[PDB]
Amino acid sequence: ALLSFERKYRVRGGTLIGGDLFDFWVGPFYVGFFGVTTAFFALLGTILIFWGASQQGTFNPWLINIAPPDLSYGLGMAPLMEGGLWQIITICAIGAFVSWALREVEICRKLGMGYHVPFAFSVAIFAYVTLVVFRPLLMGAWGHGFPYGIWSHLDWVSNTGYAYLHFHYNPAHMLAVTFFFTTTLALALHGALVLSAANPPKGEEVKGPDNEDTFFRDFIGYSIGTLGIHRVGLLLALNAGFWSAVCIIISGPVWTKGWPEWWNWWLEMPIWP
Amino acid sequence: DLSFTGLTDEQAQELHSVYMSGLWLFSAVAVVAHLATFIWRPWF
Amino acid sequence: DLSFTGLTDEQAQELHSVYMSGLWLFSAVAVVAHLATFIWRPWF
Amino acid sequence: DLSFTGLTDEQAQELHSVYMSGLWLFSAVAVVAHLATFIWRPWF
Amino acid sequence: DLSFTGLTDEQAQELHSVYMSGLWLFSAVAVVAHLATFIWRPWF
Amino acid sequence: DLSFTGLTDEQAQELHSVYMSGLWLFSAVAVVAHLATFIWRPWF
Amino acid sequence: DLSFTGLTDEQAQELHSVYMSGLWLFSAVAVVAHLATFIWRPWF
Amino acid sequence: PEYQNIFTQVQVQGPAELGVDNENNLTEERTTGTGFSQLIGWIGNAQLGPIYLGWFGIISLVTGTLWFNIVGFNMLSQVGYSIPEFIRQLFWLALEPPSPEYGLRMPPLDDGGWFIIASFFLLVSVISWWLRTYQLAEMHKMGKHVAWAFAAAIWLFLVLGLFRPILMGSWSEAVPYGIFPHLDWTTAFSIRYGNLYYNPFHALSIVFLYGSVLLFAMHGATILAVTRFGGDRELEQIYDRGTASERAGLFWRWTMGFNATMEGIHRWAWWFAVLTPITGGIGILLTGTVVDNWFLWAVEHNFAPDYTQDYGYEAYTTYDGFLGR
Amino acid sequence: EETFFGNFDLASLSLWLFYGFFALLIYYLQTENMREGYPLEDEDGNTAANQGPFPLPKEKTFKLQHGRGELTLPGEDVQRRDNLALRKTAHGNGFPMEPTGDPMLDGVGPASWSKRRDVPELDAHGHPKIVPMSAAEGFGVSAGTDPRGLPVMAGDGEIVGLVSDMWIDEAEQLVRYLELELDPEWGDGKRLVQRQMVRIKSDRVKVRSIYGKHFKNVPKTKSPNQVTLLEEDKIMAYYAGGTLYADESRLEPQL
Amino acid sequence: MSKFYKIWLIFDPRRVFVAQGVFLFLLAAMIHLVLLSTEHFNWFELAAANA
Amino acid sequence: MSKFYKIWLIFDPRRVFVAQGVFLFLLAAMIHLVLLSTEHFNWFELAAANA
Amino acid sequence: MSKFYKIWLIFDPRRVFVAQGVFLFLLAAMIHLVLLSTEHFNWFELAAANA
Amino acid sequence: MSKFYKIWLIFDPRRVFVAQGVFLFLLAAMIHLVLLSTEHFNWFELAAANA
Amino acid sequence: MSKFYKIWLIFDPRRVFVAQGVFLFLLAAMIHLVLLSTEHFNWFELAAANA
Ligand code: BCL
Ligand code: BCL
Ligand SMILES: CC[C@H]1c2cc3[nH]c4c(c3C)C(=O)[C@H](C(=O)OC)c4c3nc(cc4[nH]c(cc(n2)[C@@H]1C)c(C(C)=O)c4C)[C@@H](C)[C@@H]3CCC(=O)OC/C=C(\C)CCC[C@H](C)CCC[C@H](C)CCCC(C)C
Ligand SMILES: CC[C@H]1c2cc3[nH]c4c(c3C)C(=O)[C@H](C(=O)OC)c4c3nc(cc4[nH]c(cc(n2)[C@@H]1C)c(C(C)=O)c4C)[C@@H](C)[C@@H]3CCC(=O)OC/C=C(\C)CCC[C@H](C)CCC[C@H](C)CCCC(C)C
Numbered sequence A: 001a002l003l004s005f006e007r008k009y010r011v012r013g014g015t016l017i018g019g020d021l022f023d024f025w026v027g028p029f030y031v032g033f034f035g036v037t038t039a040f041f042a043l044l045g046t047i048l049i050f051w052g053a054s055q056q057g058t059f060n061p062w063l064i065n066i067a068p069p070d071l072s073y074g075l076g077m078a079p080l081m082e083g084g085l086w087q088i089i090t091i092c093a094i095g096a097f098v099s100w101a102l103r104e105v106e107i108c109r110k111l112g113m114g115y116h117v118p119f120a121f122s123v124a125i126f127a128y129v130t131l132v133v134f135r136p137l138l139m140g141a142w143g144h145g146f147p148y149g150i151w152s153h154l155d156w157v158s159n160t161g162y163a164y165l166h167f168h169y170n171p172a173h174m175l176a177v178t179f180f181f182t183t184t185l186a187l188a189l190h191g192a193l194v195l196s197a198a199n200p201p202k203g204e205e206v207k208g209p210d211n212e213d214t215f216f217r218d219f220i221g222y223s224i225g226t227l228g229i230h231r232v233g234l235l236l237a238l239n240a241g242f243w244s245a246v247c248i249i250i251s252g253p254v255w256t257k258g259w260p261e262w263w264n265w266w267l268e269m270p271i272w273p
Numbered sequence B, C, D, E, F, G: 001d002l003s004f005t006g007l008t009d010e011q012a013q014e015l016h017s018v019y020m021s022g023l024w025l026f027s028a029v030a031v032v033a034h035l036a037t038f039i040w041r042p043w044f
Numbered sequence H: 001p002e003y004q005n006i007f008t009q010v011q012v013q014g015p016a017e018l019g020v021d022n023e024n025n026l027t028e029e030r031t032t033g034t035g036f037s038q039l040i041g042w043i044g045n046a047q048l049g050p051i052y053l054g055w056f057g058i059i060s061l062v063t064g065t066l067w068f069n070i071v072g073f074n075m076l077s078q079v080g081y082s083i084p085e086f087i088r089q090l091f092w093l094a095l096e097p098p099s100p101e102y103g104l105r106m107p108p109l110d111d112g113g114w115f116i117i118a119s120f121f122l123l124v125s126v127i128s129w130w131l132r133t134y135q136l137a138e139m140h141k142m143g144k145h146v147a148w149a150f151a152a153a154i155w156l157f158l159v160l161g162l163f164r165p166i167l168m169g170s171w172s173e174a175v176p177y178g179i180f181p182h183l184d185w186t187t188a189f190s191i192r193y194g195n196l197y198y199n200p201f202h203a204l205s206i207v208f209l210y211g212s213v214l215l216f217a218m219h220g221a222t223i224l225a226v227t228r229f230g231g232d233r234e235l236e237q238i239y240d241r242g243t244a245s246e247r248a249g250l251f252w253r254w255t256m257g258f259n260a261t262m263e264g265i266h267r268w269a270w271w272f273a274v275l276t277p278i279t280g281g282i283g284i285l286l287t288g289t290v291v292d293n294w295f296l297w298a299v300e301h302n303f304a305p306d307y308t309q310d311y312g313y314e315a316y317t318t319y320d321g322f323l324g325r
Numbered sequence I: 001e002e003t004f005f006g007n008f009d010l011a012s013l014s015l016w017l018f019y020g021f022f023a024l025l026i027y028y029l030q031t032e033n034m035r036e037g038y039p040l041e042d043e044d045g046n047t048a049a050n051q052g053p054f055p056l057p058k059e060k061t062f063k064l065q066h067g068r069g070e071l072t073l074p075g076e077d078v079q080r081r082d083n084l085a086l087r088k089t090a091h092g093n094g095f096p097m098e099p100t101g102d103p104m105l106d107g108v109g110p111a112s113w114s115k116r117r118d119v120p121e122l123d124a125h126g127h128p129k130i131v132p133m134s135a136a137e138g139f140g141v142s143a144g145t146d147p148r149g150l151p152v153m154a155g156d157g158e159i160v161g162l163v164s165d166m167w168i169d170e171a172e173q174l175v176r177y178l179e180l181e182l183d184p185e186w187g188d189g190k191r192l193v194q195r196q197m198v199r200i201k202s203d204r205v206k207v208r209s210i211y212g213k214h215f216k217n218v219p220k221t222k223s224p225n226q227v228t229l230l231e232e233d234k235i236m237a238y239y240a241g242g243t244l245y246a247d248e249s250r251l252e253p254q255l
Numbered sequence J, K, L, M, N: 001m002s003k004f005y006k007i008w009l010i011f012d013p014r015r016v017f018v019a020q021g022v023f024l025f026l027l028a029a030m031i032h033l034v035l036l037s038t039e040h041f042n043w044f045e046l047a048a049a050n051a
């Protein structure tokens, strides 16, 4: 089933690899080389998770937990029932995420658009890879990654935060939190302004961009425009992701003491009496 | 005759012959390698 | 006659014949492998 | 005559015959498997 | 007459008759299963 | 007359008749079930 | 005349006359409920 | 490569836009005077000003300035009026809520009176600002979506500072006014009542915050990628559909199996953002008044994980082995 | 605090109420997004037998400015194209379509346009929104590099003409289009390019999407002072179709 | 008194009915639960500690 | 009471039927669950103890 | 009861059939799982104990 | 019933076949995995113990 | 059973073949990996211990 305007866009071509060996649709979904790889990796990972759950002893979604190996194994391969399953599932997840991004690139190419969406997804992929690959590699053990469980991956965050004592004193954490809050506020304001323009009180005509510009200059004295708001939102979200990755990567391999101690450079500058 | 790729029957036969030849050569090399490895360090 | 794909009766019969020829060979190979594995290490 | 899918009465009968044959074959295989398993390890 | 879906009366009558046949067969199988279960392990 | 849904009086009367029949059947089954339960384990 | 809903005086009269019967019946059921509850377990 | 439309290639400047008007006569209260900034013109509009001056805006400005000055002068007096030491310890100072022994009574100025006065002024300022944002939309003949989304954040603000201390019966339950001192309050609040992770409404709030950031990333990238078809003019695309909207919908339909409209994406965005403070406030209001230990609650409701291995370093290594001796 | 039954306290009741509310909200949000493009069809143009899990919404009405009337949605697809030069490559569903003639000239594929109104977009005063710079009072270049007079470079590396003017958006103070004057060897008349497909350098302007021989077939405007919505859709679709149809190597797999 | 029919000239009959249906169900549920919370009027536990 | 059929001149039956079905099933499930949290009316435990 | 067939003049059969198909399987799975959570009606543990 | 063949006048066979294949495979995998979570019916562990 | 060839009048082989190819390799990898996580059937460890 197609939308009323969809048929004229479903043309052949625009693939990075494969040609027309995989150039078709299944329902609404587009299939390609990277669709095939995505299906393989995602299905294998999910089935392996459920096999590990059956061998653990519980099928409760809240209670399933698949964990990385002990620190004494270093960077080698562990027995499959003591941490190897986590490593295999990690490999599957990385493959699946990269395949998803490349499939998005192929769809963008076929539709004649820019490649902003795959680029934006790459930052989330980068944060995940920093969490599970780069930090354990620098720290020297695969056992530093977080476990795969709905409620057990919060205990990891808690214990990792309290291992540097007071984690709110991390400056990069401060920057990331600020970016998150500002992104949410901007999204609320943008949605509200567009809806208010398009949906006036009953019996009234609709409004235009001049009206929106006037509301915000009256409200706060400045208006960013209908093109600047999208740039600003994208930049804020990407900065949030990037600084989250930086804040986690500096906690283990670069700083070892508690985070309040870091501000001693400010507290003891020579310029003070 | 049914064809989605535009090839004919004769062309498909001729291509399949060479493809089978390559497959058999690959398999023979792999068999020799597996025999040597088993002699060196046997599983099973 | 009902045909969502555009094929005729004879084309479907030919395709099914070749497909089942492939299926039976796959199954025979798997049966031989399973018998050898059971002789090596039984699971019943 | 009511038809959402565009099929006809005779086409639906012809399709249903083959569908039911496949269902019965699947069920027969499942019954034999369940009987072998019950003889191996009873659950009642 | 009033009809939100587009069917007539005869089509609705036929559809409901077949639906009722299916419901009765389902219920009969469920009843047999419940009776066997009660004989095996009685509640109440 | 007043109508927000687009029906006429006769259609509403017929619909209400069928709805009341369904409601009474549901209520009768529930009453029999409640009587059996009270005999099995009385409350009050 | 003032009418913020668009209905006429007679329509409102009939609607209220129908609504009051349902209100009275709902109240009547509640009296029989509260009369049996008191006998079972008084609260005064 | 192709132009990516992040910074404008060339800028143009004309007469300043003073704004639209109607019978409500908005021009009467507007300031005269505008400026142009070429540095911010690379990313958005360059014009600065003018602004609207009403009663609500002036009241809000005065009360907020008073709150700021009260906090600042208390912090300055707490250090001996020494300016270099005031600068040295700026991030560590605060104006502190009253002691628990005073209940809801008025405390002395030394032990929370100034805190109460500052809180009253801040509350007046915020409510006046909300009134101004409502009145402007009423006078522009537009919808009231901005006011309703500001009211959703004001709900969590009020729950944190007013409603919960009244329900618990003590003004000592509020938040201190300081930078490092309010991050100390956050951590201590989490520790005092078990683990705030196991509060299901905190988890729902996190769900909605993560989702709103994800949605803004998606929407910004998508609109920037169809700008070559004039996609940034969203209102005209709502009134008269074009190929930008069709391509934007078909991308996500072919990606994940369903899509939105040009007008319907903003409804999704509006709800995901507003649902964050609402669930957060519901979660905060239930803590201490209903539930006192969230981990024990999770144990009772059977969603706390269980661990089999042992605790302590001597089950994994040796003190000499760690030191390398 | 006490429990009504078992472990049921106020928190559990609040949680279940939120679950119900969220289900209703999800239904509402999904339904509000089905006002364009429904009902669904198959690849032959007929109504599909499957229509989904969610029923269609009720109708809403807009009131447009400058006396354009009303818009009620959902309704009939008034932006639909009539004769498409496309062909099917399979007897069933789920396979691509193949262009019949020239996809760039026929407006199919990534070269597709939608049938918008044949009138210009207006500002709050009721005037055309996009105007050539030669007829805008008090406007001028304030930063960046002025592109007027610089030569234009094609995607294959050919010089086709010079930039003669810019068309700006007066209400939002932004440049929308670049106007070119074609050399006699590469066509006649003037053409427009959207600002989002060009790169302005110190000595030239570069357009990479289409080649030198494609510049004479760019759709033209009817008037030298304004452009309608249809014309804009047709012009921008033409420029975007070249990212796939300008060269045979842009369509075949890259590997 | 007998002029109470005029209420339907101000309020729309549909939404008032919906609101009364919801409010009445919630009221009945709350009253049944508040009675269950006590000890003299709990019928499950009274039936348990009777036989 | 003879004029109760006019409710279908106000409410659309298509929405009413769906709402009623959801409400009836949820109510029945909730009552059955409440019965299973007691000790005098839990038929599974009653069967276990009886044997 | 003889006019119950008119429900198909109100509800679309395709959506109803899909919804019922999902509902019946979910209900059956829930009931089997509820049985497995008891001590008296768990047939795997019974099979283990009887052997 | 001899009129059951009319289900194909309402549902498209192409979509029903795909849904049935997915459902059947997932159900089989679920059952096979439920068996392996017990001690009495885990055939790998029984094989290990019998040696 | 003799009319099973008519499935190719419903489904195009081009989609079916890729679906089957993905499914079979997924199954093989899953089964080999499941065997490799036991003690009795892990052939790599059996070879090491036997020496
Ligand atoms: C004691 C606990 C410490 C603490 C410990 C930590 C630690 C430790 C960490 C942070 C991290 C974060 N902290 Mg902190 N933090 C604390 C208190 C707070 C508070 C607060 C008090 O209000 C806030 C607002 C935050 C918030 C934050 C963010 C700045 C950051 C979250 C990462 C992120 O969003 O990356 C988002 C990116 C991702 C990882 C998402 C990846 C997505 C992938 C690519 C896609 C998956 C697809 C999926 C499988 C598909 C499924 C759907 C299909 C249908 C199947 N912290 C306390 C004080 N904080 C985390 C961080 O920054 O790590 C990077 C972190 O590790
Ligand atoms: C050790 C720390 C505890 C913890 C303690 C808390 C506490 C305590 C709280 C949060 C709360 C929140 N937590 Mg938590 N939280 C922890 C760890 C985390 C982690 C993580 C580890 O990844 C994350 C991502 C979060 C995330 C969150 C947010 C989802 C949520 C805040 C809601 C919001 O919208 O804020 C946005 C903030 C606001 C809208 C506040 C109101 C702002 C008003 C409108 C400002 C008015 C204007 C001003 C006065 C004038 C300025 C003047 C100008 C110059 C003009 N928490 C750990 C477990 N969390 C809050 C919540 O809701 O909990 C349920 C909360 O109270
Ligand atoms: C993040 C959103 C917050 C916000 C921010 C904000 N306020 C702003 C701006 C912004 C982004 C301006 O651009 C505008 C301004 O001119 O800032 C310098 C302004 C402003 N709106 C204000 C009021 C105001 N808005 C408020 C609200 C808010 N606006 C939000 C809380 C509040 C509060 C917190 O209650 C107040 C008090 C002042 C802060 C300032 C006053 C501007 C004005 O009166 O008219 C417009 C400007 C002119 C008179 C002409 C230029 C002179 C400028 C005041 C200085 C800069 C000129 C310089 C040549 C350019 C340098 C670049 C600038 C960006 C700094
Ligand atoms: C949906 C929830 C999200 C949200 C929404 C939200 N916030 C909002 C709104 C909305 C919809 C507004 O409409 C409103 C607004 O004005 O936005 C521009 C606002 C707002 N959200 C704000 C803050 C804020 N929101 C936050 C969070 C959030 N806001 C959530 C993520 C947070 C945090 C902690 O995350 C903060 C800190 C303000 C910027 C603004 C409310 C402004 C207000 O109420 O001001 C009252 C006035 C005063 C107290 C006067 C202060 C006096 C100053 C000392 C000087 C004068 C002001 C001057 C301009 C500043 C100094 C400038 C220097 C250059 C001198």
Ligand SMILES: COC(C)(C)C(=O)C/C=C(\C)CC/C=C(\C)CC/C=C(\C)CCCC/C(C)=C/CCC(C)CC/C=C(\C)CCC=C(C)C
Residues within 6 Å of the ligand: B014, B015, B018, B019, B020, B021, B022, B023, B026, N028, N029, N032, N033
């Ligand atoms: C142990 O457990 C784990 C999971 C770890 C595993 O390891 C599991 C592993 C598996 C389950 C593995 C499964 C592996 C397979 C199914 C492998 C299959 C491999 C093949 C079918 C290989 C085929 C190779 C064929 C080749 C090489 C053919 C031809 C090569 C040529 C060079 C021929 C050239 C042809 C020409 C020139 C034709 C030109 C003709 C004209 C007319 C132009």
Ligand SMILES: COC(C)(C)C(=O)C/C=C(\C)CC/C=C(\C)CC/C=C(\C)CCCC/C(C)=C/CCC(C)CC/C=C(\C)CCC=C(C)C
Residues within 6 Å of the ligand: B002, C014, C015, C018, C019, C020, C021, C022, C023, C026, M028, M029, M032, M033, N031, N034
């Ligand atoms: C034990 O518990 C766990 C969960 C761990 C399990 O392991 C559970 C496992 C299962 C539940 C497993 C279930 C497995 C199945 C249902 C498997 C089914 C397998 C098949 C149906 C396999 C079919 C294979 C068919 C093949 C190979 C057919 C043909 C192959 C060909 C190469 C034929 C090629 C045909 C041509 C060229 C036709 C061309 C003809 C023309 C005329 C053009």
Ligand SMILES: COC(C)(C)C(=O)C/C=C(\C)CC/C=C(\C)CC/C=C(\C)CCCC/C(C)=C/CCC(C)CC/C=C(\C)CCC=C(C)C
Residues within 6 Å of the ligand: D002, E014, E015, E018, E019, E020, E021, E022, E023, E024, E026, K028, K029, K030, K032, K033, L027, L031, L034, M003, M004, M005, M006, M007, M009, M010
């Ligand atoms: C104990 O406490 C707890 C909570 C744990 C519980 O377990 C509580 C449980 C409940 C309260 C459960 C309640 C359960 C129900 C109310 C269940 C109701 C079930 C039904 C009404 C089922 C009906 C099924 C009907 C069927 C299958 C009928 C027919 C199907 C077909 C006929 C298929 C064929 C259709 C065709 C051919 C269409 C014909 C088309 C034409 C054009 C003629």
Ligand SMILES: COC(C)(C)C(=O)C/C=C(\C)CC/C=C(\C)CC/C=C(\C)CCCC/C(C)=C/CCC(C)CC/C=C(\C)CCC=C(C)C
Residues within 6 Å of the ligand: F002, G014, G015, G018, G019, G020, G021, G022, G023, G024, G026, J027, J031, J034, K003, K004, K006, K007, K009, K010
């Ligand atoms: C804990 O204990 C405490 C005391 C704290 C409490 O719990 C406090 C409780 C209270 C304070 C409770 C208060 C309760 C009330 C005030 C209750 C009031 C109830 C009513 C007014 C009920 C009215 C019901 C009316 C009904 C049922 C009428 C009609 C129903 C119909 C279905 C029929 C209507 C049909 C129509 C109109 C057809 C339309 C006709 C046309 C011609 C179009």
Ligand SMILES: COC(C)(C)C(=O)C/C=C(\C)CC/C=C(\C)CC/C=C(\C)CCCC/C(C)=C/CCC(C)CC/C=C(\C)CCC=C(C)C
Residues within 6 Å of the ligand: F044, G029, G032, G033, G034, G036, G037, G040, J017, J018, J020, J021, J022
């Ligand atoms: C949605 O909006 C609109 C406008 C449509 C409405 O408002 C709609 C409203 C409705 C559709 C409302 C519907 C309401 C009902 C269906 C209500 C039904 C109420 C009952 C059936 C109540 C029954 C109550 C019974 C009680 C309380 C019984 C108590 C019994 C005892 C305490 C036992 C005491 C023992 C005795 C009497 C011994 C008996 C001995 C004998 C010899 C007989």
Ligand SMILES: COC(C)(C)C(=O)C/C=C(\C)CC/C=C(\C)CC/C=C(\C)CCCC/C(C)=C/CCC(C)CC/C=C(\C)CCC=C(C)C
Residues within 6 Å of the ligand: E002, E003, F011, F014, F015, F016, F018, F019, F020, F021, F022, F023, F026, J028, J029, J032, J033, K031, K034, L003, L004, L005, L006, L007, L009, L010
């Ligand atoms: C003890 O305390 C606690 C809180 C624990 C409780 O448990 C409290 C419980 C309550 C407060 C419970 C309250 C319960 C109610 C008020 C229940 C009310 C129930 C009903 C009103 C039920 C109505 C059922 C009606 C039915 C089943 C009707 C069926 C109709 C049909 C099948 C016919 C359909 C109609 C057609 C086809 C129209 C014909 C079509 C044409 C086109 C002519």
Ligand SMILES: COC(C)(C)C(=O)C/C=C(\C)CC/C=C(\C)CC/C=C(\C)CCCC/C(C)=C/CC[C@H](C)CC/C=C(\C)CCC=C(C)C
Residues within 6 Å of the ligand: C002, D014, D015, D018, D019, D020, D021, D022, D023, D024, D026, L028, L029, L032, L033, M027, M031, M034, N003, N004, N005, N006, N007, N009, N010
């Ligand atoms: C124990 O508790 C738990 C929860 C753990 C459980 O395990 C609970 C489990 C359940 C509740 C399970 C319930 C399971 C079911 C209800 C299963 C039902 C299964 C079926 C009805 C399966 C039917 C399969 C039918 C098939 C495969 C039939 C035929 C297929 C074909 C014939 C293919 C060929 C088709 C052709 C050629 C048609 C073309 C014809 C033309 C004329 C063109």
Ligand SMILES: COC(C)(C)C(=O)C/C=C(\C)CC/C=C(\C)CC/C=C(\C)CCCC/C(C)=C\CCC(C)CC/C=C(\C)CCC=C(C)C
Residues within 6 Å of the ligand: H068, H069, H070, H071, H072, H073, H076, H116, H119, H120, H122, H123, H157, H158, H159, H160, H161, H162, H175, H176, H177, H178, H179, H182
């Ligand atoms: C002296 O030097 C000068 C003059 C330059 C200064 O003025 C310098 C000033 C400073 C350096 C100031 C610095 C100020 C800060 C760092 C302030 C930080 C403030 C916060 C982080 C504040 C958080 C506040 C509130 C929070 C977290 C939540 C909720 C609060 C409220 C709802 C408050 C509302 C209170 C009410 C309603 C109680 C009122 C009581 C009544 C009885 C009406």
Ligand SMILES: [Fe+3]
Residues within 6 Å of the ligand: A190, A194, H219, H223, H234
């Ligand atoms: Fe937008």
